[PDB]
Amino acid sequence: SVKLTMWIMPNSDTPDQDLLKVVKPFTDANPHITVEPTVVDWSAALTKITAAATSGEAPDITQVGSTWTAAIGAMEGALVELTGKIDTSAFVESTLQSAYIKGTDKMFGMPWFTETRALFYRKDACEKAGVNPETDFATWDKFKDALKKLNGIEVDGKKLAALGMPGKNDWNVVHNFSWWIYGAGGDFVNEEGTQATFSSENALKGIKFYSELAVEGLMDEPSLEKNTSDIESAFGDGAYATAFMGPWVISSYTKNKEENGNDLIDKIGVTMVPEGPAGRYAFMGGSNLVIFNSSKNKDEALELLKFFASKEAQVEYSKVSKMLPVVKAAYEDPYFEDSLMKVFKEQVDKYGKHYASVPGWASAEVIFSEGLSKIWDNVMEVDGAYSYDKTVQIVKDVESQINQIL
Numbered sequence: 001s002v003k004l005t006m007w008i009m010p011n012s013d014t015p016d017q018d019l020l021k022v023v024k025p026f027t028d029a030n031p032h033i034t035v036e037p038t039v040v041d042w043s044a045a046l047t048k049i050t051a052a053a054t055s056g057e058a059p060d061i062t063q064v065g066s067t068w069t070a071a072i073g074a075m076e077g078a079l080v081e082l083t084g085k086i087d088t089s090a091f092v093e094s095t096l097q098s099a100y101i102k103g104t105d106k107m108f109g110m111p112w113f114t115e116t117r118a119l120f121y122r123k124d125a126c127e128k129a130g131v132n133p134e135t136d137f138a139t140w141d142k143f144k145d146a147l148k149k150l151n152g153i154e155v156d157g158k159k160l161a162a163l164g165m166p167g168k169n170d171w172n173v174v175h176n177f178s179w180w181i182y183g184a185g186g187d188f189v190n191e192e193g194t195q196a197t198f199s200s201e202n203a204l205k206g207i208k209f210y211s212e213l214a215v216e217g218l219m220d221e222p223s224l225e226k227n228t229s230d231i232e233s234a235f236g237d238g239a240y241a242t243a244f245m246g247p248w249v250i251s252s253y254t255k256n257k258e259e260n261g262n263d264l265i266d267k268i269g270v271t272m273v274p275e276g277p278a279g280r281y282a283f284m285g286g287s288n289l290v291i292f293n294s295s296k297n298k299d300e301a302l303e304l305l306k307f308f309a310s311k312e313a314q315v316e317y318s319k320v321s322k323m324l325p326v327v328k329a330a331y332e333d334p335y336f337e338d339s340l341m342k343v344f345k346e347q348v349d350k351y352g353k354h355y356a357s358v359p360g361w362a363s364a365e366v367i368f369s370e371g372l373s374k375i376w377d378n379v380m381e382v383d384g385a386y387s388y389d390k391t392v393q394i395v396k397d398v399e400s401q402i403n404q405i406l
């Protein structure tokens, strides 16, 4: 049988085994094709995927972050153009924007799953502090008042930090700013995706509101020294009253109960992100699938991609990974009425905004990770007291950098 090689980022608790279980129905019905997944850690994924494209030494297939798809597809001769080979009618239409290069009709990836970041909260902490999550998290300033009530209260054998978020360089630095900028009434780029615009008055108001939560003590300043993975573990250990995180954490916290007796999962809830003056907006992310032009099994690889778009494969990978499907028929399944999953679905469906699918965005995120993290260094007073004016200068500088890339 053809052994399709496939790179995946760590999308679930046991990524390789989980992937293999989801594709077992495919090999059952296609005995000539097996799948060998290889895990590629997120911090190395852009360099490794890019090196695979430029060198010609590549697997048959790789997962690609939705925001990077245009960058890899724009590399001449790197990927197989999928335009016309995939029935787009089956997909949630909003998920297709990242499969194309913006400004063209060229599709170089197939949507695989979507995700957004929602507001997890500890029910016991909110009940003690008199915080009512559905309404007290509904707006910027109601959220802020809620953090004031939650900060420092004693739950279990610890003093809880009201909000815990990472500040260290990783791909989520910009993602965690995104919906504060959108909700303030700003954006990262103009409609054409050719000019950076997040130094606008409204964009800065969202950057100022969010970053100054830590200056005011409502967001845990020491936690800014950590990355997303460390924040997710800390919240799983009960360190924070609230945190903005993706749905995948539900897998880890559920296993923590099954394996360690940590019942955190049973005393947490999730609400949509608070609404800003622009209305509610949320980060829309996810990953697509691509076929390398160097593959010697392009026919078999396309069959596997089509399987991953099937209703049952979309549901089963959602159940194990907690990512949201991109195929409309998958939402006929009652699984997405789950109390936690339904929140992510409603939020990304109604309010999810994705970045412009331009070839330069991958290089833009490299700069964002380094540039916007300097705002957190300003908050942490690494070099001098905090000042908003220094944040404005960082944002102006980062914007200039992005403008050179575009």
Ligand SMILES: OC[C@H]1O[C@@H](O[C@H]2[C@H](O)[C@@H](O)[C@H](O[C@H]3[C@H](O)[C@@H](O)[C@H](O)O[C@@H]3CO)O[C@@H]2CO)[C@H](O)[C@@H](O)[C@@H]1O
Pocket (backbone or CB within 6 Å): 009, 010, 011, 012, 013, 042, 064, 065, 066, 067, 068, 115, 170, 171, 172, 228, 229, 230, 232, 246, 248, 284, 285, 286, 287, 365
């Ligand atoms: O910006 C590049 C892409 O990022 C995607 O978000 C991913 C984050 O970059 C990544 O840090 C995070 O990693 C999770 C992992 O999914 C999970 O299995 C593990 O348990 O915890 C990690 C965090 O500590 O995963 C997300 C989602 O894959 C965007 O979705 C994508 O649009 C974007 O191109």
